[PDB]
Amino acid sequence: EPVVCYLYGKRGGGKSLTSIALATKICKHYGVEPEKNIYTKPVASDYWDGYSGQLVCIIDDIGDEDWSDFCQLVSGCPMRLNSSPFIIATSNWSNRRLHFKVEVKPASFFKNPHNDMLNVNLAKTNDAIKDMSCVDLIMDGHNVSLMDLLSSLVMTVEIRKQNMTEFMELWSQ
């Protein structure tokens, strides 16, 4: 049902900021108010209870084995009313359906020297927040931009907006 974008990396490495940036860019793409269309909560069995139709859902800090819990959340995702929400998951580490796995770490210039975390002040002054160029996004082995990721997610949604998945299975045999 839902396209899951899976962002992982070290604490304070930029995965959280990126999840929100991606979330709001998804909302802007679809002509929708971000502050009303981002449902973000730490992973938990009652994650969906407070949900009320936000376009984008963020499932945070998938740690303490939380992966079985998060697998349930995806399989049991509710519907929307435009028909699935985008799902962004964050986690310290990586690791079967249609998904995007993206490692998030600071771009070399913006890695804090004291700790290997993201220097958000420096990214701010360097106008590197708007496009999240302050961050390295690593997907299928290579660096990718936030807009590339957004564009890829939106396109595969448009692909599934058609009702082709059955035929694509057939065509793929």
N, CA and C atoms as an extended XYZ file, in Angstrom:
519
Properties=species:S:1:pos:R:3:atomname:S:1:resname:S:1:resid:I:1 pbc="F F F"
N         0.834       -1.195        0.000 N   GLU     1
C         0.000        0.000        0.000 CA  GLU     1
C         0.876        1.254        0.000 C   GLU     1
N         1.686        1.455        1.059 N   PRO     2
C         2.399        2.732        1.187 CA  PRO     2
C         3.852        2.681        0.740 C   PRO     2
N         4.344        3.789        0.193 N   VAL     3
C         5.764        3.931       -0.114 CA  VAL     3
C         6.479        4.312        1.172 C   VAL     3
N         7.457        3.512        1.576 N   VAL     4
C         8.227        3.781        2.783 CA  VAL     4
C         9.606        4.279        2.366 C   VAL     4
N         9.990        5.460        2.866 N   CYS     5
C        11.339        6.005        2.726 CA  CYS     5
C        12.052        5.841        4.064 C   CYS     5
N        13.162        5.106        4.055 N   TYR     6
C        13.854        4.660        5.262 CA  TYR     6
C        15.182        5.404        5.356 C   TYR     6
N        15.276        6.322        6.317 N   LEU     7
C        16.459        7.142        6.540 CA  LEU     7
C        17.178        6.641        7.788 C   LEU     7
N        18.473        6.347        7.671 N   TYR     8
C        19.233        5.850        8.813 CA  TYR     8
C        20.579        6.556        8.891 C   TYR     8
N        21.127        6.589       10.098 N   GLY     9
C        22.410        7.214       10.347 CA  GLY     9
C        22.601        7.477       11.825 C   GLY     9
N        23.778        8.015       12.144 N   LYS    10
C        24.172        8.239       13.527 CA  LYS    10
C        23.389        9.397       14.143 C   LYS    10
N        23.342        9.405       15.474 N   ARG    11
C        22.582       10.413       16.204 CA  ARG    11
C        23.112       11.809       15.899 C   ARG    11
N        22.194       12.729       15.609 N   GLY    12
C        22.580       14.077       15.243 CA  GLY    12
C        23.308       14.171       13.926 C   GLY    12
N        23.226       13.131       13.098 N   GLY    13
C        23.885       13.111       11.810 CA  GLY    13
C        23.115       13.761       10.692 C   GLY    13
N        21.857       14.120       10.935 N   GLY    14
C        21.025       14.790        9.952 CA  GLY    14
C        19.796       14.017        9.526 C   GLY    14
N        19.604       12.776        9.983 N   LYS    15
C        18.460       11.996        9.517 CA  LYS    15
C        17.142       12.623        9.957 C   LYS    15
N        17.112       13.201       11.157 N   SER    16
C        15.874       13.775       11.671 CA  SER    16
C        15.502       15.034       10.898 C   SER    16
N        16.438       15.979       10.788 N   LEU    17
C        16.189       17.169        9.985 CA  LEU    17
C        15.749       16.795        8.572 C   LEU    17
N        16.420       15.809        7.963 N   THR    18
C        16.093       15.411        6.597 CA  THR    18
C        14.682       14.845        6.507 C   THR    18
N        14.282       14.029        7.483 N   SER    19
C        12.921       13.503        7.481 CA  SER    19
C        11.892       14.632        7.442 C   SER    19
N        12.110       15.695        8.218 N   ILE    20
C        11.174       16.815        8.215 CA  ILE    20
C        11.265       17.585        6.902 C   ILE    20
N        12.485       17.819        6.414 N   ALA    21
C        12.644       18.530        5.149 CA  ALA    21
C        11.943       17.772        4.026 C   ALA    21
N        12.222       16.466        3.916 N   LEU    22
C        11.529       15.628        2.940 CA  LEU    22
C        10.021       15.682        3.141 C   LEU    22
N         9.567       15.559        4.389 N   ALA    23
C         8.138       15.626        4.676 CA  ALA    23
C         7.513       16.920        4.149 C   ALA    23
N         8.108       18.078        4.470 N   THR    24
C         7.519       19.338        4.020 CA  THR    24
C         7.647       19.513        2.514 C   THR    24
N         8.717       19.001        1.903 N   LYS    25
C         8.826       19.099        0.453 CA  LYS    25
C         7.788       18.220       -0.227 C   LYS    25
N         7.489       17.054        0.353 N   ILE    26
C         6.378       16.253       -0.150 CA  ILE    26
C         5.082       17.049       -0.063 C   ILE    26
N         4.850       17.696        1.079 N   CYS    27
C         3.614       18.450        1.258 CA  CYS    27
C         3.520       19.606        0.266 C   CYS    27
N         4.615       20.344        0.070 N   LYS    28
C         4.605       21.418       -0.917 CA  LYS    28
C         4.338       20.866       -2.310 C   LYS    28
N         4.960       19.737       -2.655 N   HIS    29
C         4.749       19.192       -3.990 CA  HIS    29
C         3.266       18.990       -4.266 C   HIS    29
N         2.523       18.489       -3.277 N   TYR    30
C         1.116       18.151       -3.443 CA  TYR    30
C         0.173       19.278       -3.029 C   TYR    30
N         0.673       20.501       -2.870 N   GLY    31
C        -0.194       21.648       -2.599 CA  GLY    31
C        -0.939       21.600       -1.280 C   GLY    31
N        -0.223       21.321       -0.191 N   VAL    32
C        -0.816       20.957        1.089 CA  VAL    32
C         0.019       21.602        2.184 C   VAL    32
N        -0.636       21.931        3.288 N   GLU    33
C         0.022       22.673        4.359 CA  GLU    33
C         0.865       21.724        5.198 C   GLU    33
N         2.187       21.928        5.284 N   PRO    34
C         3.019       20.962        6.025 CA  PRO    34
C         2.696       20.854        7.504 C   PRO    34
N         2.493       21.977        8.194 N   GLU    35
C         2.244       21.911        9.629 CA  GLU    35
C         0.999       21.096        9.964 C   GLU    35
N         0.077       20.905        9.014 N   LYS    36
C        -1.113       20.092        9.251 CA  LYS    36
C        -1.002       18.678        8.690 C   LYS    36
N         0.061       18.373        7.943 N   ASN    37
C         0.140       17.112        7.215 CA  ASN    37
C         1.433       16.357        7.482 C   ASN    37
N         1.963       16.472        8.693 N   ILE    38
C         3.093       15.671        9.139 CA  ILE    38
C         2.722       15.065       10.489 C   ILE    38
N         2.551       13.741       10.526 N   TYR    39
C         2.266       12.987       11.748 CA  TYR    39
C         3.558       12.282       12.157 C   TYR    39
N         4.187       12.750       13.237 N   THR    40
C         5.499       12.253       13.647 CA  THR    40
C         5.463       11.821       15.106 C   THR    40
N         5.868       10.577       15.355 N   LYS    41
C         5.876        9.985       16.686 CA  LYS    41
C         6.976        8.929       16.737 C   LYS    41
N         7.576        8.702       17.907 N   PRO    42
C         8.474        7.544       18.049 CA  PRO    42
C         7.739        6.228       17.810 C   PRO    42
N         8.476        5.246       17.272 N   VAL    43
C         7.886        3.947       16.965 CA  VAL    43
C         7.241        3.373       18.216 C   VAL    43
N         6.064        2.777       18.044 N   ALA    44
C         5.320        2.220       19.164 CA  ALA    44
C         4.065        1.516       18.665 C   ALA    44
N         3.573        0.533       19.422 N   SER    45
C         2.455       -0.273       18.940 CA  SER    45
C         1.199        0.563       18.726 C   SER    45
N         0.978        1.588       19.555 N   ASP    46
C        -0.171        2.475       19.397 CA  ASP    46
C         0.131        3.665       18.495 C   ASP    46
N         1.028        3.497       17.523 N   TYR    47
C         1.462        4.633       16.718 CA  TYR    47
C         0.310        5.226       15.920 C   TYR    47
N        -0.577        4.382       15.405 N   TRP    48
C        -1.607        4.861       14.497 CA  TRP    48
C        -2.808        5.464       15.204 C   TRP    48
N        -2.893        5.344       16.528 N   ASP    49
C        -4.114        5.739       17.223 CA  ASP    49
C        -4.404        7.222       17.038 C   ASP    49
N        -3.401        8.066       17.249 N   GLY    50
C        -3.553        9.496       17.105 CA  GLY    50
C        -3.572        9.996       15.681 C   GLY    50
N        -3.533        9.098       14.704 N   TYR    51
C        -3.448        9.523       13.315 CA  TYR    51
C        -4.798       10.030       12.823 C   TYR    51
N        -4.764       11.083       12.004 N   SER    52
C        -5.988       11.704       11.507 CA  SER    52
C        -5.823       12.205       10.080 C   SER    52
N        -5.102       11.457        9.255 N   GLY    53
C        -5.144       11.691        7.829 CA  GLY    53
C        -4.049       12.569        7.290 C   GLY    53
N        -2.972       12.767        8.042 N   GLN    54
C        -1.888       13.609        7.563 CA  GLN    54
C        -1.221       12.967        6.352 C   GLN    54
N        -0.855       13.802        5.377 N   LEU    55
C        -0.298       13.278        4.131 CA  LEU    55
C         0.977       12.482        4.376 C   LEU    55
N         1.807       12.922        5.318 N   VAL    56
C         3.109       12.314        5.567 CA  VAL    56
C         3.178       11.852        7.019 C   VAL    56
N         3.651       10.624        7.220 N   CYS    57
C         3.876       10.055        8.541 CA  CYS    57
C         5.366        9.800        8.726 C   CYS    57
N         5.879       10.141        9.904 N   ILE    58
C         7.264        9.880       10.275 CA  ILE    58
C         7.240        8.942       11.472 C   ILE    58
N         7.997        7.855       11.385 N   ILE    59
C         8.111        6.880       12.464 CA  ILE    59
C         9.535        6.951       12.995 C   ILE    59
N         9.700        7.450       14.214 N   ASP    60
C        11.014        7.895       14.649 CA  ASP    60
C        11.775        6.861       15.478 C   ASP    60
N        13.097        7.017       15.496 N   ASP    61
C        13.974        6.318       16.434 CA  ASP    61
C        13.637        4.831       16.532 C   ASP    61
N        13.583        4.171       15.375 N   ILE    62
C        13.455        2.721       15.335 CA  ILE    62
C        14.748        2.154       15.905 C   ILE    62
N        14.742        1.826       17.191 N   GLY    63
C        15.934        1.307       17.831 CA  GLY    63
C        16.100       -0.185       17.624 C   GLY    63
N        17.642       -2.192       22.095 N   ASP    64
C        16.189       -2.294       22.187 CA  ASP    64
C        15.592       -2.575       20.810 C   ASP    64
N        15.143       -3.810       20.607 N   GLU    65
C        14.656       -4.243       19.302 CA  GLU    65
C        13.268       -3.661       19.057 C   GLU    65
N        13.183       -2.671       18.167 N   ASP    66
C        11.911       -2.075       17.777 CA  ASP    66
C        11.489       -2.445       16.363 C   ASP    66
N        12.256       -3.292       15.671 N   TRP    67
C        12.036       -3.493       14.241 CA  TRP    67
C        10.793       -4.336       13.974 C   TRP    67
N        10.531       -5.343       14.812 N   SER    68
C         9.299       -6.114       14.667 CA  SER    68
C         8.076       -5.220       14.830 C   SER    68
N         8.105       -4.329       15.823 N   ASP    69
C         7.014       -3.379       16.021 CA  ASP    69
C         6.802       -2.523       14.776 C   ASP    69
N         7.887       -1.972       14.226 N   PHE    70
C         7.764       -1.111       13.054 CA  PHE    70
C         7.267       -1.882       11.841 C   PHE    70
N         7.665       -3.148       11.703 N   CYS    71
C         7.158       -3.953       10.598 CA  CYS    71
C         5.645       -4.097       10.672 C   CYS    71
N         5.105       -4.269       11.881 N   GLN    72
C         3.657       -4.307       12.046 CA  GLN    72
C         3.029       -2.995       11.598 C   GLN    72
N         3.598       -1.872       12.038 N   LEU    73
C         3.009       -0.573       11.731 CA  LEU    73
C         2.818       -0.398       10.229 C   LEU    73
N         3.832       -0.763        9.444 N   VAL    74
C         3.735       -0.602        7.997 CA  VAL    74
C         2.662       -1.522        7.434 C   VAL    74
N         2.715       -2.805        7.795 N   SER    75
C         1.744       -3.752        7.264 CA  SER    75
C         0.321       -3.355        7.629 C   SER    75
N         0.132       -2.710        8.776 N   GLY    76
C        -1.200       -2.337        9.205 CA  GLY    76
C        -1.471       -0.850        9.125 C   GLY    76
N        -1.035       -0.215        8.044 N   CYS    77
C        -1.210        1.224        7.908 CA  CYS    77
C        -2.655        1.543        7.527 C   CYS    77
N        -3.230        2.601        8.082 N   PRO    78
C        -4.592        2.995        7.712 CA  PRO    78
C        -4.594        3.809        6.419 C   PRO    78
N        -5.798        4.156        5.972 N   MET    79
C        -6.000        4.904        4.740 CA  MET    79
C        -6.147        6.394        5.033 C   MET    79
N        -6.145        7.185        3.961 N   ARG    80
C        -6.257        8.632        4.010 CA  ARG    80
C        -7.588        9.036        3.365 C   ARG    80
N        -7.666       10.266        2.861 N   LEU    81
C        -8.862       10.717        2.162 CA  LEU    81
C        -8.542       11.865        1.211 C   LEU    81
N        -7.893       11.562        0.089 N   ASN    82
C        -7.587       12.577       -0.915 CA  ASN    82
C        -8.883       13.062       -1.556 C   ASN    82
N        -4.268        7.376       -1.517 N   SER    83
C        -5.118        6.992       -0.392 CA  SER    83
C        -4.309        6.342        0.724 C   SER    83
N        -2.992        6.308        0.542 N   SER    84
C        -2.068        5.952        1.602 CA  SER    84
C        -1.188        7.146        1.953 C   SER    84
N        -0.819        7.323        3.221 N   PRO    85
C         0.166        8.360        3.542 CA  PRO    85
C         1.563        7.914        3.135 C   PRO    85
N         2.394        8.883        2.741 N   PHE    86
C         3.829        8.627        2.682 CA  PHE    86
C         4.318        8.266        4.080 C   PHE    86
N         5.240        7.308        4.164 N   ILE    87
C         5.849        6.922        5.433 CA  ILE    87
C         7.349        7.155        5.345 C   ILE    87
N         7.865        7.959        6.267 N   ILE    88
C         9.294        8.154        6.467 CA  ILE    88
C         9.654        7.523        7.806 C   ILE    88
N        10.612        6.602        7.793 N   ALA    89
C        11.130        5.968        8.999 CA  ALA    89
C        12.571        6.405        9.212 C   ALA    89
N        12.937        6.649       10.468 N   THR    90
C        14.304        6.988       10.834 CA  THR    90
C        14.818        5.928       11.802 C   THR    90
N        16.140        5.786       11.867 N   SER    91
C        16.747        4.671       12.583 CA  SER    91
C        18.252        4.871       12.619 C   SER    91
N        18.877        4.230       13.603 N   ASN    92
C        20.327        4.271       13.710 CA  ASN    92
C        20.978        3.491       12.580 C   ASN    92
N        20.382        2.365       12.194 N   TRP    93
C        20.985        1.464       11.226 CA  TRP    93
C        19.970        1.103       10.148 C   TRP    93
N        20.466        0.437        9.104 N   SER    94
C        19.630       -0.048        8.015 CA  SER    94
C        18.915       -1.321        8.440 C   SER    94
N        18.418       -2.069        7.458 N   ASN    95
C        17.953       -3.437        7.643 CA  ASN    95
C        17.274       -3.674        8.983 C   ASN    95
N        11.744       -5.451        2.242 N   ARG    96
C        11.314       -6.612        1.469 CA  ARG    96
C        10.228       -6.237        0.464 C   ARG    96
N         9.773       -4.985        0.524 N   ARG    97
C         8.724       -4.486       -0.359 CA  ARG    97
C         9.285       -3.323       -1.168 C   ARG    97
N         8.437       -2.414       -1.632 N   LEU    98
C         8.932       -1.268       -2.384 CA  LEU    98
C         9.334       -0.192       -1.387 C   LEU    98
N        10.629        0.097       -1.304 N   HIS    99
C        11.106        1.061       -0.327 CA  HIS    99
C        12.371        1.737       -0.827 C   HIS    99
N        12.691        2.857       -0.187 N   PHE   100
C        13.917        3.604       -0.420 CA  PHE   100
C        14.714        3.623        0.879 C   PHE   100
N        15.942        3.111        0.836 N   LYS   101
C        16.862        3.125        1.967 CA  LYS   101
C        17.921        4.194        1.718 C   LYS   101
N        18.060        5.134        2.656 N   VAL   102
C        18.941        6.287        2.476 CA  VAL   102
C        19.770        6.483        3.735 C   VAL   102
N        21.091        6.374        3.611 N   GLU   103
C        21.971        6.731        4.714 CA  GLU   103
C        22.142        8.246        4.741 C   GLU   103
N        22.081        8.823        5.938 N   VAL   104
C        22.164       10.269        6.119 CA  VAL   104
C        23.316       10.569        7.066 C   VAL   104
N        24.274       11.360        6.596 N   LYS   105
C        25.381       11.835        7.409 CA  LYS   105
C        25.725       13.259        6.990 C   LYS   105
N        26.456       13.989        7.829 N   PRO   106
C        26.821       15.362        7.450 CA  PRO   106
C        27.781       15.370        6.270 C   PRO   106
N        27.573       16.327        5.367 N   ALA   107
C        28.575       16.620        4.353 CA  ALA   107
C        29.862       17.054        5.040 C   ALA   107
N        30.999       16.651        4.467 N   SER   108
C        32.279       16.851        5.141 CA  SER   108
C        32.404       18.263        5.689 C   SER   108
N        32.046       19.265        4.885 N   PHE   109
C        32.266       20.634        5.330 CA  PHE   109
C        31.433       20.954        6.557 C   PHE   109
N        30.332       20.233        6.762 N   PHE   110
C        29.385       20.554        7.821 CA  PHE   110
C        29.407       19.558        8.973 C   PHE   110
N        30.331       18.606        8.959 N   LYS   111
C        30.547       17.747       10.116 CA  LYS   111
C        31.189       18.555       11.238 C   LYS   111
N        30.531       18.594       12.390 N   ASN   112
C        31.120       19.235       13.555 CA  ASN   112
C        32.524       18.677       13.785 C   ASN   112
N        33.494       19.505       14.178 N   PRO   113
C        34.831       18.961       14.460 CA  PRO   113
C        34.890       18.224       15.790 C   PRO   113
N        34.192       18.750       16.797 N   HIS   114
C        34.246       18.147       18.125 CA  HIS   114
C        33.574       16.781       18.130 C   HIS   114
N        32.360       16.707       17.598 N   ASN   115
C        31.624       15.467       17.428 CA  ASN   115
C        31.295       15.310       15.951 C   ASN   115
N        30.988       14.083       15.538 N   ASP   116
C        30.762       13.837       14.119 CA  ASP   116
C        29.305       14.097       13.762 C   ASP   116
N        28.696       15.081       14.417 N   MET   117
C        27.307       15.439       14.188 CA  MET   117
C        27.209       16.595       13.192 C   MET   117
N        25.977       16.952       12.835 N   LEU   118
C        25.735       17.971       11.819 CA  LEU   118
C        25.800       19.368       12.427 C   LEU   118
N        26.590       20.246       11.800 N   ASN   119
C        26.755       21.637       12.233 CA  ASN   119
C        25.626       22.451       11.605 C   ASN   119
N        24.524       22.582       12.350 N   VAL   120
C        23.327       23.208       11.793 CA  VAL   120
C        23.503       24.716       11.691 C   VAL   120
N        24.241       25.318       12.625 N   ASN   121
C        24.518       26.747       12.536 CA  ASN   121
C        25.271       27.073       11.253 C   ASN   121
N        26.326       26.301       10.953 N   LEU   122
C        27.121       26.537        9.749 CA  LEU   122
C        26.308       26.291        8.485 C   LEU   122
N        25.507       25.223        8.472 N   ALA   123
C        24.618       24.981        7.342 CA  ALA   123
C        23.655       26.146        7.141 C   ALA   123
N        23.123       26.697        8.235 N   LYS   124
C        22.248       27.863        8.147 CA  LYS   124
C        22.947       29.021        7.443 C   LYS   124
N        24.121       29.416        7.943 N   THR   125
C        24.796       30.582        7.382 CA  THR   125
C        25.254       30.330        5.953 C   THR   125
N        25.456       29.066        5.581 N   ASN   126
C        25.899       28.710        4.242 CA  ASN   126
C        24.738       28.384        3.312 C   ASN   126
N        23.506       28.702        3.717 N   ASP   127
C        22.334       28.520        2.868 CA  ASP   127
C        22.265       27.083        2.369 C   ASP   127
N        22.566       26.143        3.264 N   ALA   128
C        22.578       24.724        2.936 CA  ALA   128
C        21.430       23.967        3.588 C   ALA   128
N        20.459       24.672        4.156 N   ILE   129
C        19.289       24.028        4.746 CA  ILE   129
C        18.166       23.886        3.726 C   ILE   129
N        17.921       24.946        2.952 N   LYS   130
C        16.842       24.959        1.970 CA  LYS   130
C        16.831       23.693        1.120 C   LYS   130
N        17.993       23.290        0.614 N   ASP   131
C        18.109       22.097       -0.212 CA  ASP   131
C        18.777       20.939        0.514 C   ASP   131
N        19.104       21.106        1.793 N   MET   132
C        19.789       20.078        2.574 CA  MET   132
C        21.049       19.574        1.886 C   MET   132
N        21.749       20.474        1.192 N   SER   133
C        23.096       20.194        0.715 CA  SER   133
C        24.100       20.060        1.855 C   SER   133
N        23.724       20.429        3.080 N   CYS   134
C        24.600       20.238        4.224 CA  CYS   134
C        24.752       18.772        4.587 C   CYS   134
N        24.041       17.881        3.901 N   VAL   135
C        23.919       16.485        4.296 CA  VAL   135
C        24.275       15.627        3.097 C   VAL   135
N        24.955       14.518        3.354 N   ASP   136
C        25.148       13.490        2.345 CA  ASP   136
C        24.013       12.475        2.444 C   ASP   136
N        23.280       12.276        1.345 N   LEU   137
C        22.293       11.203        1.235 CA  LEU   137
C        22.854       10.103        0.342 C   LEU   137
N        22.980        8.894        0.890 N   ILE   138
C        23.613        7.779        0.194 CA  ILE   138
C        22.565        6.696       -0.013 C   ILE   138
N        22.225        6.463       -1.278 N   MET   139
C        21.161        5.559       -1.683 CA  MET   139
C        21.674        4.671       -2.804 C   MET   139
N        21.563        3.361       -2.605 N   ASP   140
C        22.058        2.372       -3.555 CA  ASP   140
C        23.495        2.677       -3.968 C   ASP   140
N        24.323        2.994       -2.974 N   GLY   141
C        25.751        3.088       -3.157 CA  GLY   141
C        26.274        4.458       -3.527 C   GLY   141
N        25.417        5.360       -3.994 N   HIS   142
C        25.865        6.637       -4.521 CA  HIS   142
C        25.171        7.795       -3.821 C   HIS   142
N        25.842        8.943       -3.866 N   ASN   143
C        25.303       10.172       -3.305 CA  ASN   143
C        24.105       10.647       -4.119 C   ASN   143
N        23.135       11.234       -3.424 N   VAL   144
C        21.909       11.695       -4.058 CA  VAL   144
C        21.451       12.950       -3.327 C   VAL   144
N        20.766       13.822       -4.053 N   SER   145
C        20.264       15.057       -3.475 CA  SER   145
C        18.860       14.845       -2.922 C   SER   145
N        18.464       15.735       -2.007 N   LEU   146
C        17.113       15.677       -1.455 CA  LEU   146
C        16.064       15.767       -2.557 C   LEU   146
N        16.272       16.663       -3.522 N   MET   147
C        15.311       16.819       -4.611 CA  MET   147
C        15.253       15.569       -5.486 C   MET   147
N        16.404       14.935       -5.737 N   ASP   148
C        16.407       13.651       -6.435 CA  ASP   148
C        15.542       12.632       -5.706 C   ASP   148
N        15.771       12.475       -4.399 N   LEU   149
C        14.981       11.542       -3.600 CA  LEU   149
C        13.500       11.872       -3.682 C   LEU   149
N        13.149       13.131       -3.416 N   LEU   150
C        11.763       13.560       -3.554 CA  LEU   150
C        11.216       13.174       -4.919 C   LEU   150
N        11.943       13.535       -5.977 N   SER   151
C        11.460       13.277       -7.329 CA  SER   151
C        11.249       11.783       -7.558 C   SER   151
N        12.166       10.950       -7.049 N   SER   152
C        12.032        9.505       -7.207 CA  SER   152
C        10.801        8.989       -6.474 C   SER   152
N        10.605        9.414       -5.228 N   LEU   153
C         9.428        8.990       -4.481 CA  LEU   153
C         8.143        9.403       -5.195 C   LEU   153
N         8.067       10.668       -5.626 N   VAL   154
C         6.848       11.175       -6.254 CA  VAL   154
C         6.559       10.423       -7.540 C   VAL   154
N         7.603       10.114       -8.310 N   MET   155
C         7.397        9.397       -9.562 CA  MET   155
C         6.881        7.979       -9.320 C   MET   155
N         7.513        7.222       -8.413 N   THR   156
C         7.020        5.873       -8.145 CA  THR   156
C         5.612        5.886       -7.550 C   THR   156
N         5.193        6.992       -6.933 N   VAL   157
C         3.800        7.124       -6.521 CA  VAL   157
C         2.914        7.313       -7.746 C   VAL   157
N         3.362        8.150       -8.687 N   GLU   158
C         2.615        8.344       -9.924 CA  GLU   158
C         2.525        7.042      -10.705 C   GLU   158
N         3.612        6.264      -10.712 N   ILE   159
C         3.574        4.948      -11.343 CA  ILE   159
C         2.484        4.093      -10.709 C   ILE   159
N         2.463        4.026       -9.374 N   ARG   160
C         1.432        3.271       -8.666 CA  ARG   160
C         0.081        3.978       -8.677 C   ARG   160
N         0.039        5.275       -8.994 N   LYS   161
C        -1.251        5.939       -9.161 CA  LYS   161
C        -2.054        5.270      -10.272 C   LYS   161
N        -1.414        4.991      -11.407 N   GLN   162
C        -1.950        3.995      -12.320 CA  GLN   162
C        -2.163        2.687      -11.560 C   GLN   162
N        -3.062        1.848      -12.063 N   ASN   163
C        -3.265        0.531      -11.460 CA  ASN   163
C        -2.578       -0.523      -12.327 C   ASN   163
N        -1.244       -0.496      -12.249 N   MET   164
C        -0.391       -1.325      -13.085 CA  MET   164
C         0.281       -2.467      -12.342 C   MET   164
N         0.379       -2.392      -11.011 N   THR   165
C         1.237       -3.315      -10.271 CA  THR   165
C         0.991       -4.767      -10.666 C   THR   165
N        -0.272       -5.143      -10.865 N   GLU   166
C        -0.563       -6.483      -11.363 CA  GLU   166
C         0.162       -6.748      -12.679 C   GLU   166
N        -0.015       -5.862      -13.663 N   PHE   167
C         0.610       -6.083      -14.964 CA  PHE   167
C         2.130       -6.086      -14.854 C   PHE   167
N         2.688       -5.188      -14.038 N   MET   168
C         4.139       -5.108      -13.913 CA  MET   168
C         4.709       -6.412      -13.373 C   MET   168
N         4.013       -7.029      -12.418 N   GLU   169
C         4.362       -8.379      -11.998 CA  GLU   169
C         4.437       -9.298      -13.209 C   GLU   169
N         3.348       -9.345      -13.984 N   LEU   170
C         3.313      -10.150      -15.200 CA  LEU   170
C         4.459       -9.789      -16.141 C   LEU   170
N         4.575       -8.506      -16.499 N   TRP   171
C         5.633       -8.080      -17.407 CA  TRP   171
C         7.023       -8.405      -16.876 C   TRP   171
N         7.171       -8.588      -15.566 N   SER   172
C         8.483       -8.828      -14.984 CA  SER   172
C         8.883      -10.296      -14.997 C   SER   172
N         7.936      -11.206      -15.196 N   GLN   173
C         8.254      -12.624      -15.331 CA  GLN   173
C         8.995      -12.849      -16.646 C   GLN   173
